[PDB]
Amino acid sequence: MEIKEVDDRAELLRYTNNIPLLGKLVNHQPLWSTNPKLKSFSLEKISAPDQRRVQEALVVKDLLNVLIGLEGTYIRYFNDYEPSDPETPIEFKIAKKMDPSFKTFSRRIVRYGKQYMILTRAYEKWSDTSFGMVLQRFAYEIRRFLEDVYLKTLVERLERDFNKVPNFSIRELEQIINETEVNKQMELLYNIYEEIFREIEERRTNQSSQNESSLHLRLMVAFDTTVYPVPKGGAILKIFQQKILENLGDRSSVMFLKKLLNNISQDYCTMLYEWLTQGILNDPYQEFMTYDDLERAWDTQYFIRKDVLLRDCDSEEDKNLLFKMLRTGILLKVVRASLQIPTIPSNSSDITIQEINDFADLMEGSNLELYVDKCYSRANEIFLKLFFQG
Amino acid sequence: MEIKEVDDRAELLRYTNNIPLLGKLVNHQPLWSTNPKLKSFSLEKISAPDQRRVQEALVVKDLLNVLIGLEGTYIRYFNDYEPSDPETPIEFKIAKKMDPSFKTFSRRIVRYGKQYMILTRAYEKWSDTSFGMVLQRFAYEIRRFLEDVYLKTLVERLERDFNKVPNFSIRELEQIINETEVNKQMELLYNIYEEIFREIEERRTNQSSQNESSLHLRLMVAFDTTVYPVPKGGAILKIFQQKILENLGDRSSVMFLKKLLNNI
């Protein structure tokens, strides 16, 4: 192949304000559509059955480049692809003169390459602060997955066999992609991405849309029915529990999804535990089920974010449990503020509360009910001791 | 590399009247600029990406020799270096046909080589009696640093890896220098030396210069407002305290400077 001469220079982006915390800071390489660095050796010159494997070698090289979102010689970006646009669509156009079997296989691989690009862009985007640490931990999980499963598989199997294994092929490439299940794990992460994206789109377009139990108690409270632009906390744990309810029967998929749900929600379980045992509200990303005002000092009015709730709050027992959690937290903060202490001693009651180590396990049965009941009894014991002896 | 024939007699110095107490008493070796002992094998002939490690090894040898002030085959003193004159300036010029990455790393390491030369010359000078025991103890601490830390690092790490450790390279040389803190501690010593030097220069140029409590009390005592040519005692302990202040936050630099002050 001949060599064309284009000025190619790597450099950090000058304007880094519209770039997320983990967005790519280096500029983009020269695109084949505008700045080709090779006089493309047209394919039909090696289309004969004796040059078929040479064509396969070229195409598999281009596919190993595509599987990480780089354009090969014969598999180039869509005409509408704009790399300087973080919202740009992502498609690949395949050399028309390619062997049709290679073309089919290359389409099926281009699919996973586009999924890789989209997921990379998605973890970059959700690494920001406005998305809540549930979605941030999810983005971290996506990045960890790519780097330590998908990139590992690519590098150590497909590229390594291209370099090392004779009689390697493109059908063996797709087979190896399907073996390690990395395509199914990518399909699960990309389905979760698509669901979060569809919900964001609904919340951004369906904007024109907008109990006596809240008064039956002695409460300076209010429901916060603000439908936030991006789902947070419970709104995304509902997405994950729904994707577990949908993928039942495929047990590897369910194990993967449950590992995801248990990793992502660790910090959320920490929030809920600290709330139900200390009345602490360490919510910097505004995603807990309840919050206060004045961010005179004790004059606090609690709100309930109906958007980030773990449950529906429609039924009777659901509102009972919700208000019991809010009440546990209120009583424990009142105790802490009374004793001027920063935390509540662990021995200030005979009822000990264990942490939350498996979120799905907490949400699945009535474990949330009994857990909040234990926390509520402990809070009421401490609170009535305070108010009856001090 | 083929040998050249020059006269190299290592003898003591004839006149030692303007030499400090610890000043060097031998004469200087022949410089490459005037008396080269080898025909320099031009580096352009090993610029091929296959012979790149050969040029790397030659540059590492020159660097291990520069690190103690000795000019190498391809890294040499510049033109104004006069070895007999002790107040000479010190810079190294690097072979222009060297690989540009090797030139960059070599300039970085030449910084340390020049700092070693200047610090050795500094304690040699400050070993005199006209400098006060504070500057003399600082010169003793400088020489003990060199001998027991800088030369120990140099030999037992850099030369032992250049002789026994494959996969060693100039970038790993600079990494080793940065990891052992030798660059940071030597930079600290060189900053203190430069502060003492600017002080000496001010006191040498600022010659346009000129308490009632000693009278409110029965004290037949006067003030000696003499501004000496070199700082002594408190005028140097103040420099060290000022350095410890300017290094607040770098606990390693603060510990080094505090041990230096407690020693001096």
Place this chain on the structure above:
Amino acid sequence: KSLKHEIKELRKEKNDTLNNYDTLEEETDDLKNRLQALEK
């Protein structure tokens, strides 16, 4: 709004130019496919 409008026009012009370049390459290949039977 004017900067965004120039971006919209320049993107449309890029997309049109690339579709024209693809079309011209198909014409180039058709001309080569005619000509190679004469020059061989």
Place this chain on the structure above:
Amino acid sequence: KSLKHEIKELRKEKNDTLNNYDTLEEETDDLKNRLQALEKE
């Protein structure tokens, strides 16, 4: 106001793409001239 960088990048990328397009029209014209020399005979 940094939208001006995408404007300059698109203008440069368009001009590069148009230099490719003009070069491919010169190649198109060369092929048409070579066809007009041979295909008639």
Place this chain on the structure above:
Amino acid sequence: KSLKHEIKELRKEKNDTLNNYDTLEEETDDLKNRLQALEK
């Protein structure tokens, strides 16, 4: 004072000679490279 003057003049001549040497060596090497091509 006279000895210090002579030292300064001799130091200057040395520096100029050394700078001239390098300029001359560079010319010498360009000529060698041209010659190696011609003798080859």
Place this chain on the structure above:
Amino acid sequence: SSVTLRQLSNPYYVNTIPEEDILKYVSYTLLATTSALFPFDHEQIQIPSKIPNFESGLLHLIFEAGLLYQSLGYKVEKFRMLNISPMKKALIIEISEELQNYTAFVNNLVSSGTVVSLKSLYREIYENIIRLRIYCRFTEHLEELSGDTFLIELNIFKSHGDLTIRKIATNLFNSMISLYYEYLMNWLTKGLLRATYGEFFIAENTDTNGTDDDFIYHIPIEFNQERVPAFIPKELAYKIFMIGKSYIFLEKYCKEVQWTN
């Protein structure tokens, strides 16, 4: 058919730079140095024309680490010669220590010989590219924000969901808070406001308007309630202010030198 697909693809990419030479020179380019292959410019790396668009894209991804290392080294060398508060110096030291760990990691990769392709080199430095990205984002406004603002921001980022951002923020916060504890310790045991650069909630205020020019009635020290960090209760902040004020009082006006010492 023992010919691998790489050997079948090679004859079409012979006018390009072989991968092994690209690796030899990337060894240096990752450390923000120039070379004969990648002539690292002012702040550009100038990828040659013998490197096609796919290798060029992969090299852009890889050289993100080299450019980030260069920018962070520039920040370190700039602030190493400036006059900055101790807490900014601790932040600069954490930056330079990250750069030192990155240099050690790149040198281990290159010297081990286990890196045989650009894609494996990209996967190996991926998380290091991410860490350098975080470090270069956190310190974009280094010369424009005070140490306590950095404490507030890193306290916000200690709750991030990403473990890497959270860990970097936690370490930066722990170093800057060690030096803030040194500020507090100085003020509480010596009444010193030495080298705080306006990062402390207690500032020496010798600004008077003719009333008490010699501080007979004043003790020229003010206590800004708007600068108290969110991790210190205003009651404990007032107690700190009063402990320092009482130490300075006892030592300067009550001449109680032995007991204050």
